[PDB]
Amino acid sequence: PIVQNLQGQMVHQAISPRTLNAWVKVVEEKAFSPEVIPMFSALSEGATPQDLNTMLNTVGGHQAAMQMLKETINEEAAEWDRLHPVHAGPIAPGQMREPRGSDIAGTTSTLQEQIGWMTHNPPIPVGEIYKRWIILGLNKIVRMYSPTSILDIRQGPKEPFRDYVDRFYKTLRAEQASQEVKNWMTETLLVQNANPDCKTILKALGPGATLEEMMTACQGV
Amino acid sequence: PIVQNLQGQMVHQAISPRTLNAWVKVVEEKAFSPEVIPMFSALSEGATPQDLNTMLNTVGGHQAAMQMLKETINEEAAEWDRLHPVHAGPIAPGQMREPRGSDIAGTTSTLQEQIGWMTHNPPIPVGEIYKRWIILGLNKIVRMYSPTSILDIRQGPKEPFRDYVDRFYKTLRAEQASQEVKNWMTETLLVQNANPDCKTILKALGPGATLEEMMTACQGV
Amino acid sequence: PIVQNLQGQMVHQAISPRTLNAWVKVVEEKAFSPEVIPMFSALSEGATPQDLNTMLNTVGGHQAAMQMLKETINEEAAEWDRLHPVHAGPIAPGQMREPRGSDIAGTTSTLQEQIGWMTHNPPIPVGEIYKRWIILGLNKIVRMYSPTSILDIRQGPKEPFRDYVDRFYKTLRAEQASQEVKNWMTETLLVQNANPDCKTILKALGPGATLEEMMTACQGV
Amino acid sequence: PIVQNLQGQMVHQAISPRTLNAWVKVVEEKAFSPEVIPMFSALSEGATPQDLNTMLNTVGGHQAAMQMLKETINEEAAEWDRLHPVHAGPIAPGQMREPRGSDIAGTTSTLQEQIGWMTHNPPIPVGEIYKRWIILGLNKIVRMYSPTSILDIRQGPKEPFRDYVDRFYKTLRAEQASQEVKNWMTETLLVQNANPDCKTILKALGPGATLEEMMTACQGV
Ligand SMILES: O=P(O)(O)O[C@H]1[C@H](OP(=O)(O)O)[C@@H](OP(=O)(O)O)[C@H](OP(=O)(O)O)[C@@H](OP(=O)(O)O)[C@H]1OP(=O)(O)O
């Protein structure tokens, strides 16, 4: 985080040990359930790339996943570097050097330049692009850790409908696809994969039946 | 939350990670018992739709209930959009764009727009209507998740009257009904289901007995 | 159709009997399989709306199909009327009047009027618009008359991959969801539903593989 | 096509509806078996590129086939542009301009232009060149849609030699390797894959035997 001192100049503030330990416990306990992404984005609000690096390195276990995240961050940094070629020439006192692909990731940047980049007007959000790369990696990790694809979620012969819907929507949350495909999956795959006992009821209800109506109608079975 | 900086400009503040973890734990332990709604409205005091979306997304299990909440929010947003038609024309410097139905939910807006909305005079409380929609959805979820119907709560042969009346009133709170049906239930169904030893005293007491009078009348057994 | 007589003046020419015979064979024997649309769009080459109605009377035998077609025509005519409000005022005597939603449909127009409309500089196409509305109706009918859903197209244990791909693409063309859902279906659902051996080869091939490579690699299995 | 009117001036004549109907039947029912090419080359007799595009829109139903066809057209157009650099300078007013790679394809040309191009002394054929590019695309598609490789065409225990030869030559015409490999296939692979009795007779006949003698000697076996 970045805060203003008494004089009003921006000063970095280290993350409290409570937040850091909460994030570490979330990563080590939850495996990589899909709710880690919102929790991470809530715990890392307006943080400098050094803070993100601390929040990532501090994790003790799940080292394979952190390695995959390292690979994804490196690929995104290389692509960004290719997109922005270096402008040769001395930097005027009124500006600062343009951050390269690895300057964003914090492997070759000091704290002061990172503070200066996004506190400048107009701002260049190093933190908000680094967090985008990290979240893009976490999406792949979460998708990998989820057991089964959405197309293989099937209600058992005896399973209650509420548990089946819970499994289906957990898997769909873990799924990686655009929003339109997710809407189609919600509309059709839910009815299509049900057990024979509830499939007839769901078809008889109609094509525009809301989730509440389906679950209250299939409550007994 | 909304806080002022040193200069006096409104600045968004992230929710405390302790509060967020407390809400997640509340949803973990309490399932969807009726006391969740006051807890939510206490933990989400004066929060922008960004914070509400964070607090809703962070929940890990019970994904079917969160999907019902999503559908209810969508219905309320569509009804709001129909109720307030779109106005065509350029935006004056002294005003801001009129929010649409999907604008209140925070899924198609920035945080700065909402900050300006809920601080500009006259206020347009996006947060205070999003919280209304969320509570409206949570009410249906709580009613549906009630483990047993009111008619099935009956005092046991050896159960003291305190336990039976507590179970009955908790179930009555969960199964939300109108006021007059609640009055009839309290007056008649409470007496009807009791064990014979308590039923005799309740009947002999009279029809217009308050809850305290019944509880202190049947205290001996 | 429209032809030029010996005096250089455009004159309507009726649809030859065997073209109507071919369209009647298409309607009565193809059972509204997804190939009715190309054959209609071929047989109706540059036809004035009177000829379009002459070809449409064949569908009048099927009550449900003709009802769907009439409803779609009327809805598109209403939308056309809404989007083109009739201008009240003097018009240049060298120009023709304006086609109403019931005059582009040939219900209340005469043949000379449509001939003048089509043979104009610049031309105002009425036949093409009417044909687009008819094709919308036929798309709806073909979607209704589909024999199986896209999620039920599964390759047999020993069916060649080419037959399965042709069946899948025919069903996907009948169902006609949006474009993005179609791309997702082609990329993922095609691989998912295949028989074990072809599924193994397609999985081992990799993700995001063009159809040519899939069919070439899975040729003799 | 191109016809001469009553004044002796070449005028374009549209493709009759039933020719387009026949081509649509060819596309939709033959499943791109190796006989689509002769029927296309027959139905497209002397057609200006506008008519070629009109016939090509039928293939637009098949996404993959149309993509392959479009790619081949574009590649050949690029090669044509490269091999015929546009000459900048004055031209004789009695001569027409030069057809670009996107003007021989009828995408950016008008009908009168192509009529003038084709009806020239000496003629500059645009229809024939466009048809050659289309046939290249169709060859690629037919090769993709083949049901079995040439090495898997084996005569059955009791299949007559004539049926086996016809199947073999159809598959060899689909696969369309170079000419020398085709001659080697015909000479050797045909004898190699035959059933034991016909293989014995063909071996005993000798090497370098014409097809007529092979089929005459192996008639009733
Ligand atoms: O080769 P042809 O003897 O000229 O056959 C054609 C051909 O029929 P088939 O391919 O079924 O044999 C036409 O079919 P299209 O592919 O053009 O559709 C068909 O026209 P219809 O489509 O109208 O059936 C026409 O039949 P018709 O005589 O009714 O015009 C018929 O010609 P023949 O009947 O003279 O064989």
Residue numbers in the entry:
A (entry chain L), B (entry chain M), C (entry chain A), D (entry chain A): 1 to 221
The authors write:
Along the body of the cone, the CA subunits are assembled on a hexagonal lattice, with the CA amino-terminal domain (NTD) making hexameric rings that are linked together by the carboxy-terminal domain (CTD). Here, we identify a Thr-Val-Gly-Gly motif that modulates CA hexamer/pentamer switching by folding into a 310 helix in the pentamer and random coil in the hexamer.
We found that IP6-induced CLPs have a range of morphologies—capped tubes and cones—when assembled at pH 8, but are primarily conical at pH 6. Local refinement with imposed fivefold symmetry resulted in a high-quality map at a nominal resolution of 3.4 Å, in which the central pentamer and surrounding hexamers are well-defined. Thus, our structure indicates that IP6 contacts with Arg18 also directly stabilize the CA hexamer, and contacts with both Arg18 and Lys25 stabilize the pentamer. These configurations are well-defined in our cryo-EM map. In the pentamer, the protein backbone overwinds at Thr58 to facilitate the α-to-310 helix transition (boxed). In the pentamer, the helix 3–helix 4 loop with the 310 helix configuration no longer interacts with helix 8 owing to repositioning of the CTD.
